[PDB]
Design a protein around this ligand. Structure first.
Ligand code: DGD
Ligand code: DGD
Ligand code: CLA
Ligand code: CLA
Ligand code: CLA
Ligand code: CLA
Ligand code: CLA
Ligand code: LMG
Ligand code: BCR
Ligand code: BCR
Ligand code: LMT
Ligand code: OEX
Ligand code: CA
Ligand code: CL
Ligand code: CL
Lengths: 37, 36, 32, 95, 450, 243, 334, 60, 119
């Protein structure tokens, strides 16, 4: 696992990799805020 | 079999060479629109 | 335990961060 | 008309362990047989009678005693090459 | 540049097409996307490290990045046992931090930086028609890729070596001291049939060939970089190709499709650059292992596996390949081209050797065959291992399966993208990408077919 | 063969070729009167196949016809271990013990008939004449061998009929199911005759080579039809352990 | 001017009754080769030892097959993925017995269909069209490549390619389901949506256009004669079709833009077929459909069955019987 | 050792602040006079944070 | 850091000592004669076969050994493996003289390794 000093942020490393999915979603959010100009 | 192999190799090489040199022969200009 | 709780807190903060950026830009009049 | 294996199942081969036709899996019910003693018995087949299973060359005292204990479960029939060819007494395609 | 349909002619769902002529904004998009890539590398590595049980093999734990680091010789020793977990952690961290930096730069260029770069600098400003500048950028990047290939070479030679699954005494991290610079071998790999038993470049089976081919790749790429910096495209290239941003994109898409197909095949078949220690057995390896496992078991039971004929009359355990070699029987006859470090000690000049099979089989080989047979790259989409008719209690899908499937899918869709963009680039260059002009509809000036 | 590696041999067909000794070889292998010598890597490479066609007329010569092999370079016995015992009078007795001592082979005949047969040397016992105090160019081991059924008793025919597995009847035709003779499978143990003429002895290395001719039955397809007679001509090699 | 230029002008000529083109210069020879061999083999090929166990399978009409049962049989499992051209067989009889015709036909066919797709692009370019009909065609091509090339590669043998026959196709399908549970694979579900929906949308579009035809004929003659080839006037009333459909479901679910409608008609089946092609191509690497066997347990721990367990029973029944003599060991890995 | 945890949590907090602010700062030309130096400052601080963590990795 | 041999620590070394002793016996008996007979195929098969666990076993010796004898044993095992790799290289190229040289190198380094073995 993560070396011992870092297992306070194990639950953050657990969710970090899916972030680019949220970027792809954020593109559509931004386009929705601009009314899909 | 060896005669067959050589003959097929010649035939295939000629067809591939045709296709390659045709697409090298200024193919983008063979269109009904712009020729730049 | 608390691993799903902590995980969901991180996930929710992340989920808000992007839309929060977009909403702030839209409301304060930044370029979009 | 039964082919040859079904006619074998008509005989004692279908009622107990045949020392000359049974597969090695069929020795598993005899505690202490599978795999070592069972392999030894199949290797030193055929047997004219059941008792010569005790005359297997090179046998050991505990294996001897196990054979004497389980003599009752054994029979000897004529070796049918259908059950013997291809080392099917070791692996007849059953898993 | 406009940011809507009336001022760009592109809808929102094709909005990135608006960037085609905004060189600064396009650079920002590229740098931010590179940040996304590096971010995923770092985050996925950290996730895998966190979710890593270092005494359970990597391939049993859904890991695709850690095997890449292990194969490079970091954090592993003999038989691939994980010595130090810290190098995996450092690779992940470094990618995460540099990803932050790349994202910041991409955001700067995409959102505040100069819209176009051509009136700010001749060096970074580019025009898609500027054949000299396009080849300059090809040259800079070719030099960089040659540097990366030589980086692999340096790691294998002078920085601890790489994992050699073919190492005598057992697979181990070893330093490659004699890479094959011999051009005959290096470039005859490229001439081998892409079919069974030859396996065009998939068949590279020793780290010496891999490292030497990478030395050659480094030299070729660097020389091509210098060649393209100092020259402009020749007449034949100018006449055959389309010279536009979308055309260059389409060319790269074709290249990417080819590479994706090749990588899927590579991970499916090759157990040298993808050691089975980290990636698990190939399908061929698992089939051969099953045949070997039952040969060994039935031999211990007393079966004379040399002379045992199966139900069809072919040998149950051993048979001949169509070229005469002694091979495992059963359906695995199709996999007789397989070579693996656990099986080659039993292979003689004629194929499998009866004497070695009868008195050279080691307990570690038996264990390895059992392991590989039970980790055959078969599994369900919800990660239930084994043949599809098995029940739910074995949570396993081979990393080779994940990698091969994903890369075949990506290769195909990038072939589709290549077709889309090549067709569009041609039509736009000829000026009919927006439909048939009613006045000059070409078919109307064409004679009737019959 | 020669002295290369599996890398040099693979996909060449050399793996199916029985090793050969030399040309300047007319040695002899002296043998004790009554001791037995192991034979290490006995190889038989078939080269010619003939099937005795069966005329419909009667009573007329059948005329072996040359067939052509449809299976590929998968026709050779190799790595066979055996023994040679020297009789009290001087007779030489070759006994096949094991190895890769069978290959299924299919030959095509003129007329389109395909003949599978189980080419084998299994349990071959062969003898020479008495008065042999050596193995030389006149050593002719003539003997017999067994020919197991081509298909094992675990084989299933296209309607899943078999001997120790499968249906015992024609299930696709419920009202005629027991009507077919092929509902009963058999695997009779056939007999073949082999002759190994030794032609070349390298007594220092122990290698003997020679010609062979074998006569055996073909596949009956679990007794569906009568066996043809297949004659195989070829070459053989082996190493005789003198010590 | 030059002989080469004249030849180029001929091959790329839009006046040829059948366009040839540079892609055509490969398509035509390979496709004719595949066709000639296919016809000859389907009619007259001798049996092929597909499973590599010397158990030849009769595929041709002359060996007792009808049209439904006939096939060009895939090459032998003994061959695996090896290249088996005619000149690598000691005799034509050997080549036939090991299934060489299958390899010849398949390789030429695949080259031909890729060249067909290139040729579609080429002709659209010569006619000044937009270029993407070939993109739609890349869906059937992808599926064909999956079943004839990708799946055999992943499985390690051309013996596991789809046979070139009707019953052979069914056999391929049944075994594929037994080994991969393709029905429970979402990409096949998407392919089914693609084809069911494509047929739905074909019927819907055809029926709405036919319903809204402008009166130009009498009740005696075919209404088809109301359309004259090469008219610009629209032959149907799209606004009336939109009125009907937006009242059938609701207004905002109906297209009123013919361009968007036809884009949707193109895109739906094409995307579905791409997905099902990718499904077959990834099950080639044994990433199979969902496995919910024994997913539902009662409180004690006994399995409660679902329809997935019944499906698995069917799959096992198919699996244990397929290639009944080919397996020596307990797991069907290869 | 608790100083290492404190530095780690500080780096994560400042990374969150950066993730929020940076796009807004680059996407507000009007308030670019006072958000251009902050950008600089923040980046430096974030850089410093990373450095501290790295050193503390070998101190802990 | 006991830094002293004991009855119980020796038994935990034995589980790796047995395979290594068998391997060294084989290396003295069979591998030498395979090299002498100019038999490269069987040489490669032997060094990848019965030896195919040598690195694991001998590193288990090294890492589970005395604090003084840990790094020394690791280095000696590495030298043995390097000579084994050169042996494989020499056998692949049919280099008899180089093969015998590397064999003597590997055997001497193996003897040096087993020298620092208690009892
Ligand atoms: C423009 C250019 C077009 C060029 C066209 C020329 C033909 C291209 C396609 C080749 C078709 C090959 C079919 C058989 C492939 C095969 O036998 O197997 C795959 C081969 C590799 O071959 C294998 O290579 C293996 C190498 O492993 C060997 O060596 C290893 C070393 O570690 C191991 O030791 C291993 O055990 C040992 O066996 C073995 O030799 C196998 O026997 C051998 O079959 O891949 C290869 O060589 C080549 C890579 C193939 C890529 C996959 C096809 C791409 C398909 C795209 C479809 C798109 C459709 C879109 C439609 C719209
Ligand atoms: C109309 C409507 C239709 C739509 C319906 C809703 C659809 C939404 C879109 C898809 C939703 C994805 C589901 C997310 C849940 C999930 O996925 O769940 C799976 C996991 C999380 O669950 C974990 O999944 C694990 C999967 O096994 C992995 O881990 C195991 C245990 O370590 C083993 O090591 C095993 O070998 C290894 O594969 C285990 O099952 C764990 O127990 C389990 O908790 O998420 C992950 O993996 C993350 C996966 C992201 C990357 C996946 C890459 C795929 C690569 C190639 C794809 C090729 C072909 C695709 C075909 C189709
Ligand atoms: C090459 C890419 C790749 C590969 C081979 C893998 C492989 C794996 N991942 Mg992973 N991952 C990836 C990318 C990849 N990942 C990316 C980009 C992310 C960021 C989101 C992640 C984040 C991630 C997490 C959090 C986890 C994994 C896990 C795993 C393992 C379990 C796989 C699984 O069950 O998923 C299930 C399969 C699916 C959900 C099906 C996905 C199908 C997609 C949608 C296909 C899209 C089709 C097509 C491209 C659509 C566009 C075409 C268009 C024209 C229509 C496995 C080894 C798990 C693991 O075991 O960790 C150790 C795990 O927990 N991954
Ligand atoms: C990798 C994905 C990617 C990238 C790098 C880009 C990049 C870009 N797009 Mg875009 N786009 C995408 C996907 C992407 N796109 C997708 C999937 C769609 C379909 C929905 C679109 C549809 C689209 C349209 C319609 C347009 C663009 C445009 C643009 C350009 C201008 C951006 C802009 O001004 O808007 C501003 C948006 C904001 C200011 C919102 C905030 C965005 C920031 C960067 C969020 C970053 C958050 C991050 C976590 C913070 C980290 C900072 C640091 C601490 C590391 C730009 C270079 C425009 C263009 O072409 O310009 C001429 C345009 O008109 N795109
Ligand atoms: C391929 C990526 C790329 C490219 C082509 C550019 C290009 C450009 N940038 Mg940019 N940038 C990038 C990434 C990139 N950037 C990233 C990742 C960041 C975040 C740190 C930035 C942040 C940034 C800012 C704040 C500014 C620019 C500016 C510029 C423009 C002026 C360049 C110049 O003269 O400065 C001088 C160039 C040098 C002094 C050379 C230094 C080379 C680097 C910094 C050292 C490392 C070299 C490395 C070893 C090489 C390989 C990299 C390695 C990672 C593989 C120019 C068009 C400026 C501008 O737009 O002017 C109006 C400007 O304001 N960039
Ligand atoms: C990504 C890297 C890259 C890219 C994008 C380019 C791009 C280009 N190069 Mg190139 N080059 C590179 C790397 C690269 N090069 C390197 C590393 C070297 C050093 C060896 C060279 C040396 C080089 C020379 C000498 C020339 C170019 C030229 C060109 C231009 C036209 C060539 C062409 O039509 O391509 C495609 C190739 C053809 C159309 C010829 C047909 C080639 C065969 C028939 C294709 C068959 C491949 C086969 C199907 C695939 C199987 C794989 C394998 C078995 C072969 C073009 C812009 C030309 C130029 O314009 O000079 C300035 C030129 O003469 N380059
Ligand atoms: C490096 C690769 C690359 C690059 C730089 C581009 C760039 C571009 N493409 Mg292109 N394309 C590519 C690959 C690429 N493409 C591939 C592989 C395909 C085959 C599918 C295509 C097919 C394609 C079409 C049909 C079109 C473009 C178009 C464009 C232009 C605008 C596109 C846009 O705004 O995106 C906007 C982004 C979106 C609308 C979001 C799309 C989301 C996809 C469909 C699903 C994502 C699935 C993914 C796997 C994640 C799964 C999520 C899961 C968790 C549910 C732009 C210049 C347009 C064009 O021609 O401009 C002139 C256009 O019509 N491309
Ligand atoms: C942008 C710039 C980012 C950094 C660029 C490279 C920096 C990497 C330097 C690390 C070198 C290791 C130092 C310690 C050492 O010698 O080895 C110490 C350990 C173990 O490594 C050991 O090194 C020894 C030194 O002679 C021997 O070589 C041993 O064989 C070896 O095992 O190394 C590690 O743990 C570090 C792992 C290496 C990971 C670095 C690659 C990732 C960084 C680049 C990716 C980011 C890209 C952004 C885009
Ligand atoms: C432009 C644009 C776009 C895009 C964007 C992008 C693409 C981006 C990005 C970006 C990126 C790419 C980023 C990033 C980041 C990173 C960060 C921010 C970091 C960090 C850090 C940290 C904090 C870490 C920590 C740690 C450590 C140190 C180790 C251990 C673990 C942990 C995790 C704790 C979009 C589409 C939206 C639209 C609009 C336009
Ligand atoms: C590293 C390595 C190696 C090596 C490798 C190498 C050495 C390579 C290479 C390679 C190369 C060197 C390549 C290439 C390529 C090419 C291509 C891919 C091409 C092409 C083409 C094209 C695309 C063209 C097109 C066209 C035509 C056809 C005509 C018209 C015009 C055009 C352009 C359209 C080895 C294996 C040893 C081992 C492993 C690792
Ligand atoms: C539970 C209740 C139902 C939940 C419904 C969830 C789905 C709702 C729609 C999702 C949002 C779509 O977002 C919608 O995009 C359209 C494009 O036509 C844009 O439409 C709007 O654009 C801008 C807003 O900035 C306005 O000036 C414009 O007059 C208006 O048309 C808006 O961005 C939003 O109205
Ligand atoms: O070959 Mn036609 O299918 Ca593919 O899975 Mn293994 O192999 Mn056979 O057994 Mn099931
Ligand atoms: Ca965790
Ligand atoms: Cl079947
Ligand atoms: Cl099998």
């Amino acid at each position: 696992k993560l070396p011992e000093a870092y297992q306070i942020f194990d639950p953050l490393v657990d969710v970090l990799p899916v972030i680019p999915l949220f970027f792809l979603a954020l593109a559509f959010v931004w386009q929705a805020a601009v009314g899909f100009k | 079999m060896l005669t067959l192999k050589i003959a097929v190799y010649i035939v295939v090489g000629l067809f591939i060479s045709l296709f390659i040199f045709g697409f090298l022969s200024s193919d983008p200009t063979r269109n009904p629109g712009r020729k730049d | 335990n608390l691993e799903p709780i902590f995980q969901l807190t991180f996930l929710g903060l992340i989920v808000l961060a992007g839309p929060a950026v977009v909403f702030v830009l839209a409301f304060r009049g930044g370029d979009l | 008309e039964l082919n040859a294996v079904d006619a074998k199942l008509t005989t004692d081969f279908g009622q107990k362990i045949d020392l000359n036709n049974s597969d090695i899996r069929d020795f598993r019910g005899l505690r202490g047989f599978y795999p070592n003693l069972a392999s030894e018995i199949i290797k030193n087949a055929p047997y004219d009678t059941v008792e010569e299973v005790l005359d297997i060359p090179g046998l050991s005292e505990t294996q001897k005693s196990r054979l004497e204990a389980n003599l009752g479960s054994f029979t000897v029939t004529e070796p049918s090459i259908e059950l013997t060819s291809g080392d099917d007494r070791i692996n007849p395609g059953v898993y | 540049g406009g940011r809507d349909l009336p001022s760009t002619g592109f809808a929102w769902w094709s909005g990135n097409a608006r960037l085609i002529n905004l060189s600064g904004k396009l650079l920002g998009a590229h740098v931010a996307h590179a940040g996304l890539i590096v971010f995923w590398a770092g985050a996925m590595t950290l996730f895998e490290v966190a979710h890593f049980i270092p005494e359970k093999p990597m391939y049993e734990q859904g890991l695709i990045l850690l095997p890449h680091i292990a194969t490079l010789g970091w954090g592993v020793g003999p038989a691939g046992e994980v010595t130090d977990i810290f190098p995996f952690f450092v690779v992940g961290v470094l990618h995460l931090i540099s990803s932050a930096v790349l994202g910041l730069g991409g955001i700067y260029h995409a959102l505040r930086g100069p819209e176009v770069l051509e009136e700010y600098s001749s060096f970074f400003g580019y025009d898609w028609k500027d054949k000299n500048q396009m080849t300059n950028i090809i040259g800079y990047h070719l030099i960089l890729l040659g540097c990366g290939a030589l980086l692999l070479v340096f790691k294998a030679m002078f920085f601890g070596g790489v994992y050699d699954t073919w190492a005598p005494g057992g697979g181990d991290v070893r330093v490659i001291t004699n890479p094959t610079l011999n051009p005959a071998i290096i470039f005859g790999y490229l001439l081998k049939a892409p079919f069974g038993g030859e396996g065009w470049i998939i068949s590279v089976n020793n780290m010496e060939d891999i490292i030497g081919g990478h030395i050659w790749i480094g030299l070729i790429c660097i020389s091509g970089g210098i060649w393209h910096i100092l020259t402009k495209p020749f007449g034949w290239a100018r006449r055959a190709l389309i010279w536009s941003g979308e055309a260059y994109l389409s060319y790269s898409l074709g290249a990417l499709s080819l590479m994706g197909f090749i990588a899927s095949v590579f991970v499916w078949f090759n157990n040298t650059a993808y050691p089975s220690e980290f990636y698990g057995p190939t399908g061929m390896e698992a089939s051969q292992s099953q045949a070997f496992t039952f040969l060994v078991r039935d031999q211990r039971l007393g079966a004379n596996i040399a002379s045992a004929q199966g139900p069809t009359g072919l040998g149950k355990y051993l048979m001949r390949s169509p070229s005469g070699e002694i091979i495992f029987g059963g359906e695995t006859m199709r996999f007789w081209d397989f070579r693996g470090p656990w099986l080659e000690p039993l292979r003689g000049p004629n194929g499998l050797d009866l004497d070695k099979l009868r008195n050279d089989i080691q307990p570690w080989q038996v264990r390895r065959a059992a392991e590989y047979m039970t980790h055959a790259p078969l599994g369900s989409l919800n990660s239930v291992g084994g043949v599809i008719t098995d029940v739910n209690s074995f949570n396993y899908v081979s990393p080779r399966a994940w990698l091969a499937t994903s890369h075949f899918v990506l290769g195909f869709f990038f072939l589709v993208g290549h077709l889309w963009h090549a067709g569009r680039a041609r039509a736009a260059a000829a000026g009919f990408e927006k439909g048939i002009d009613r006045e000059t509809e070409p078919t109307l000036f064409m004679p009737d077919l019959d | 063969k020669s002295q290369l590696t599996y890398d040099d041999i693979v996909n060449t067909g050399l793996a199916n070729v029985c090793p050969e000794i030399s040309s300047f070889t007319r040695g002899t292998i002296e043998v004790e009167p009554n001791t037995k010598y192991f034979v290490s890597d006995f190889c038989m490479e078939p080269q010619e196949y003939f099937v005795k066609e069966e005329p419909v007329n009667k009573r007329q010569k059948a005329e072996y016809v040359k067939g052509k092999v449809l299976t590929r370079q998968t026709t050779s016995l190799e790595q066979i271990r055996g023994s040679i015992a020297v009789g009290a009078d001087g007779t030489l007795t070759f006994k096949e013990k094991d190895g890769i001592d069978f290959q299924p082979i299919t030959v095509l005949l003129p007329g389109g008939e395909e003949v599978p047969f189980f080419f084998t040397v299994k349990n071959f016992t062969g003898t020479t004449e008495p008065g042999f105090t050596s193995i030389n160019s006149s050593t002719d081991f003539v003997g017999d061998f067994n020919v197991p059924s081509y298909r094992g008793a675990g084989f299933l025919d296209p309607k899943a009929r078999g001997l120790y597995t499968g249906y015992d009847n024609a299930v696709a035709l419920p009202s005629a199911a027991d009507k077919f003779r092929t509902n009963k499978k058999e695997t009779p143990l056939g007999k073949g005759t082999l002759s190994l003429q030794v032609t070349q002895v390298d007594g220092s290395t122990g290698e003997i080579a020679g010609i062979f001719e074998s006569e055996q039955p073909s596949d009956t397809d679990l007794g569906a039809k009568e066996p043809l007679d297949v004659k195989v001509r070829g070459i053989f090699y082996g190493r005789v352990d003198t010590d | 001017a030059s002989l080469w230029e004249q030849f180029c002008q001929w091959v790329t000529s839009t006046n040829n009754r059948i366009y040839v083109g540079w892609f055509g210069t490969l398509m035509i020879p390979t496709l004719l080769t595949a066709t000639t061999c296919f016809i000859i083999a389907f009619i007259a090929a001798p049996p092929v030892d597909i499973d590599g166990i010397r158990e030849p399978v009769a595929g041709s009409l002359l060996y007792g097959n009808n049209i439904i049962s006939g096939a060009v049989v895939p090459s032998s499992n003994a061959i695996g993925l090896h290249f088996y051209p005619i000149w690598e067989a000691a005799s034509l009889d050997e080549w036939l017995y090991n299934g060489g015709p299958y390899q010849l036909v398949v390789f030429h066919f695949l080259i031909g269909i890729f060249c067909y797709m290139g040729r579609q692009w080429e002709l659209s370019y010569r006619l000044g069209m937009r270029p993407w009909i070939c993109v739609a065609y890349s869906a059937p091509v992808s599926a064909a490549t999956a079943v004839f090339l990708i799946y055999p590669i992943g499985q390690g043998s051309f013996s596991d390619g789809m046979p070139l026959g009707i019953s052979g196709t069914f056999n391929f399908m049944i075994v594929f389901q037994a080994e991969h549970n393709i029905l429970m694979h979402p990409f096949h579900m998407l392919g089914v949506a693609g084809v069911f929906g494509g047929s739905l949308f074909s019927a819907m579009h055809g029926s709405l256009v036919t319903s809204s035809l402008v009166r130009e004929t009498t009740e005696v003659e075919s209404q088809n004669y109301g359309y004259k080839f090469g008219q610009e006037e629209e032959t149907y009333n799209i606004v009336a079709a939109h009125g009907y459909f937006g009242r059938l479901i609701f207004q905002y679910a109906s297209f009123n833009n013919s361009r968007s409608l036809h884009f949707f008609l193109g895109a739906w089946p094409v995307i579905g077929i791409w997905f099902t092609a990718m499904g077959v191509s990834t099950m080639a690497f044994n990433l199979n459909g969902f496995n919910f066997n024994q997913s539902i347990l009662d409180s004690q721990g006994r399995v409660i069955g679902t329809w997935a367990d019944v499906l698995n029973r069917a799959n096992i029944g198919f699996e244990v019987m397929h290639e009944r003599n080919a397996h020596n060991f307990p797991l069907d890995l290869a | 050792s608790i100083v290492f945890q404190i530095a780690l949590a500080a780096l994560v907090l400042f990374s969150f602040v950066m993730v929020v602010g940076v796009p807004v700062a680059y996407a507000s030309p009007q308030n670019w006079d006072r958000s251009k130096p902050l950008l600089y400052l923040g980046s430096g601080i974030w850089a410093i944070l990373v450095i501290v963590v790295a050193l503390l990795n070998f101190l802990v | 850091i006991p830094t002293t041999y004991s009855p119980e620590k020796i038994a935990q070394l034995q589980v790796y000592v047995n395979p290594i002793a068998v391997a060294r016996d084989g290396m003295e008996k069979r591998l030498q004669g395979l090299i002498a007979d100019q038999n490269w195929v069987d040489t490669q098969t032997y060094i990848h076969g019965p030896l195919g666990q040598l690195r694991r076993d001998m590193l288990g010796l090294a890492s589970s050994l005395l604090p003084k004898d840990q790094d020394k044993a690791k280095t000696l095992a590495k030298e043995v493996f390097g000579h084994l790799e050169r042996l494989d290289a020499a056998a692949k190229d049919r280099n008899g003289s180089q093969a015998k040289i590397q064999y003597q190198e590997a055997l001497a380094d193996f003897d040096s390794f087993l020298n620092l073995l208690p009892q």
